[PDB]
Design an enzyme around this catalytic site. Structure first.
Site, short mmCIF file in Angstrom:
data_model
loop_
_atom_site.label_atom_id
_atom_site.label_comp_id
_atom_site.label_asym_id
_atom_site.label_seq_id
_atom_site.Cartn_x
_atom_site.Cartn_y
_atom_site.Cartn_z
N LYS A 11 0.82 -1.21 0.00
CA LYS A 11 0.00 0.00 0.00
C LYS A 11 0.86 1.26 0.00
CE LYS A 11 -3.60 -2.23 2.77
NZ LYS A 11 -4.30 -2.22 4.10
N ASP A 54 -16.93 3.40 8.48
CA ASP A 54 -17.39 2.77 7.25
C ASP A 54 -17.11 1.27 7.25
OD1 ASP A 54 -18.21 2.37 4.51
OD2 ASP A 54 -17.82 4.51 4.23
#
Ligand SMILES: [Mg+2]
Ligand SMILES: [Zn+2]
EC number: 2.7.11.1
Lengths: 286, 37, 120
Positions: A122, A213
């Site tokens: 990432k 979320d």
RNA sequence: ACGGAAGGGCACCACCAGGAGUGGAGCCUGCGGCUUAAUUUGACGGGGAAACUCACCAGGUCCAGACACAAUAAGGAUUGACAGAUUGAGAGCUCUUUCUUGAUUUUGUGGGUGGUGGUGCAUGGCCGUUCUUAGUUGGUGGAGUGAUUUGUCUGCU
RNA sequence: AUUAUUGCUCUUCAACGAGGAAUUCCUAGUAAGCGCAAGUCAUCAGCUUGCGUUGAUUACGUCCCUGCCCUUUGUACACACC
């Protein structure tokens, strides 16, 4: 974007000089030619200028000749390959190349190590490029942040990808043979998996976090066996996380739970019998 | 191919003229096509 | 003094060369280089098809990681095997024409040899 | 030069108020990736598309050399009309004829013909882009030894 | 025409109960809904460009972010000291 290949064109010297521009742009804005000549700790114009020609040809550096003010500009690729070189030195990454996960402030590739164990990369791209100090700096701080959050998530037992390394704005993580709530069709023990996914939000609000979320694509599910069917509930959520003191923690938590129950209601037709955990119980739990 | 510049590419094969768009844009004024709007 | 005994000459010695005893060192290793030569057949704006450096695709597999250098002073690497004849696709640093030579450098350990005294 | 000092524009590739959405689904289609003997390749290529287009693959074919030069050759060096042998996937390919033969040599050497050999230098030039000029320029004058400056400004527009 | 060009007949009827982080486009005959024609074209679109048909909601504000500038100003860091 990222073309990792080109990195194996560079020698000891080209990395040496690129490092010198990295120490020279974090000290002054636009690093001139003599700064690179004197800081690099090199011999002559031979090595440094040949190195810089290599870097400039391979788009790791840009020549800024502003009315006699000659200088250089490190592109994102340069930073990439310096983090990646630091990792080549720290024996953490050995090969790269398969893109699964095109986020807004994060790029996710598939990598490998010395031993052949698959992993994930990432990198963080804030603004993707009109490079100032803030883009690179805040991407660096971004991956620092997410790696520390990740380390505290692996440490405390949570089923979250084990953070291996945080080379600047780039982070090496564990590859997880999992599938998101979209790609998943049916489960052998859906109530146990719901119990798990609720107990997790309970323990997360017990730690002090509310991952605002918690949708379907967020939750990965790793399979360990095919005969006995072993599941593992991985969750990717850190910059969207919201602490348990913020004014708005309530409907965030209860949105997470309502989404858990609404998906478990639609896709697997399994409604929860016990009442959903409210914010208050978890406000006392921490 | 374009009957002007040895080009397989750009061909306006319409109406039997067969000029690639680059050359046909140049020869446009000699053919009869002019800039009105 | 380096020489090779030649019976025909007046002096029964052909004087080859000279110099000095430098070093009693083993740390000096000597690598026999070995260059493989190939012609860059066809050209696409980033990928060059290269010809006559192998003749089997498995051979090309075997040498994948090994870097390609061109006497024009340019670097590159292999991609994958084209045909069943060893043709192989390749990426490079600069733009190369059909006048260049793509080459591989492979190395082997070379060992010093035993010596015997010389008389008469 | 540069600012991340401030100030104005002035803008639905900016935001408001919405409208329609997309992102979730199946299918299409392009890019990447993997796979492949090849899955041609550029970063829409008029790139629509079973042959063609094919530029990529597995095999089968031709046609090579200007010429120079040394042997052969007419009592033969070898080019053309055919029929069967053919003949493998499809064609050629070779040798027995009826035949043209008839020097186009067959073979071997060399510097380069061949440049329907491509790369580079100079020169002329055409199509593609930029400061995509949308505030510049220079001319006299003034000031300064000079870099430079004034014009090109307090105001207001 | 096999890896099914396409069209037609019967049959099979999968996913998909207004869709997360996010993001594109738009101020009047315009958005949107709707098809048609022409280019590719021998067979086809779900491709593109026009066309007509039906035809709203919401501004007519601002520099909040996005940029684009143009001013003013301090200054090359005129490469100041650590
Ligand atoms: Mg004057
Ligand atoms: Zn043309």
């Amino acid at each position: 974007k990222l073309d990792t290949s080109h990195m194996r064109y560079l020698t000891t010297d080209d990395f040496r000089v690129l490092q010198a521009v990295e120490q020279g742009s974090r000290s002054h804005e636009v690093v001139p030619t003599p700064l690179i000549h004197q800081i690099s700790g090199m011999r002559s114009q031979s090595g440094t200028n040949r190195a810089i020609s290599d870097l400039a040809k391979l788009s790791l550096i840009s020549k800024m000749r502003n009315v006699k003010y000659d200088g250089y500009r490190l592109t994102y690729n340069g930073i990439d390959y310096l983090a990646l070189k630091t990792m080549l030195n720290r024996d953490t990454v050995y090969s790269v190349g398969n893109t699964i996960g095109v986020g807004k402030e994060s790029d996710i590739y598939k990598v490998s190590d010395k031993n052949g164990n698959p992993r994930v990369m990432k990198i963080h791209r804030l603004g993707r490029s009109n490079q100032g100090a803030n883009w690179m700096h805040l991407s660096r701080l971004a991956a620092n942040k997410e790696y520390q959050f990740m380390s505290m998530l692996y440490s405390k037992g949570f089923k979250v990808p084990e953070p291996f390394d945080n080379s600047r704005h780039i982070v090496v993580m564990e590859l997880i043979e999992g599938y998101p709530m979209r790609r998943l069709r049916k489960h052998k023990n859906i109530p146990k998996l719901y119990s798990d996914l609720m107990c997790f939000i309970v323990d997360l609000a017990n730690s002090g976090l509310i991952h605002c979320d918690f949708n379907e694509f967020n939750i990965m599910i790793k399979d360990k066996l095919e005969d006995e069917n072993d599941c593992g509930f991985v969750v990717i959520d850190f910059p969207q996380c919201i602490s348990i003191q913020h004014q708005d923690a309530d409907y965030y938590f209860q949105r997470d739970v309502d989404c858990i129950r609404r998906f478990f209601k639609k896709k697997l037709k399994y409604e929860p019998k016990p009442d959903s955990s409210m914010l208050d119980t978890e406000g006392f739990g921490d | 191919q374009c009957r002007v510049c040895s080009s397989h590419t750009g061909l306006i094969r319409k109406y039997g003229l067969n000029i690639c768009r680059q050359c046909f844009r140049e020869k446009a004024n000699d053919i009869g096509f002019n800039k009105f709007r | 003094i380096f020489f090779k005994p030649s019976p025909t000459d007046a002096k029964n010695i052909e004087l080859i060369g000279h110099g000095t005893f430098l070093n009693a060192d083993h740390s000096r290793i000597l690598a026999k280089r070995a260059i493989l030569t190939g012609h860059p057949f066809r050209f696409h704006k980033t990928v060059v098809t290269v010809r006559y450096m192998f003749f089997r695709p498995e051979d090309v597999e075997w040498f994948k990681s090994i870097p390609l250098f061109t006497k024009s002073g340019r670097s590159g690497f292999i991609k994958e095997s084209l045909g069943t004849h060893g043709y192989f696709k390749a990426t490079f640093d600069g733009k190369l024409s059909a006048q260049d030579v793509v080459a591989m450098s492979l190395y082997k350990r070379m060992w010093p040899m035993p010596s015997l005294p010389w008389n008469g």
